[PDB]
Design a protein around this nucleic acid. Structure first.
Ligand SMILES: [Mg+2]
Length: 63
RNA sequence: AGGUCGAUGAGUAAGGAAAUGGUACAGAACUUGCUACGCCGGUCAGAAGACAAAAUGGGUUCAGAUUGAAGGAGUCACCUGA
């Protein structure tokens, strides 16, 4: 191995001067990915009893 | 016999530019250069098979709930009632 990092290092790699473009690249859209949030239904209250439906624990009333 | 056009091609230099020369580019062989290659490895980033769950939003549509305004023989009427 060599340890010198010269400004001569890294610019001549295949990676800069060649791009393989032939694949389809899905474009970015500002108007889709913009919105996110959380809500809780009005019946959810801190410390309510919830009914576990699908859980390995389902059928159980929980806090 | 004569005259004329044509074909071959010395020349000539008008047009043009294939051959030669010159100039400019610059892609090569060369020379300087602590690098470019690939294989494997892990991380960062991009992308991500099949069946799915949740969330958000759009086109098409379905359902359940509300509110306001105008108009009515300025609807009709009702109450109090000689
Ligand atoms: Mg790798």
């Amino acid at each position: 191995a060599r340890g010198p990092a010269g400004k001569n290092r890294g610019v001549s790699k295949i990676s800069k001067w060649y791009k393989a473009d032939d694949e389809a690249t899905p474009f970015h859209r500002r108007q889709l990915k913009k919105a996110t949030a959380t809500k809780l239904r009005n019946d959810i209250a801190p410390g309510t009893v919830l009914i576990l439906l699908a859980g390995r624990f389902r059928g159980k009333r929980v806090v």
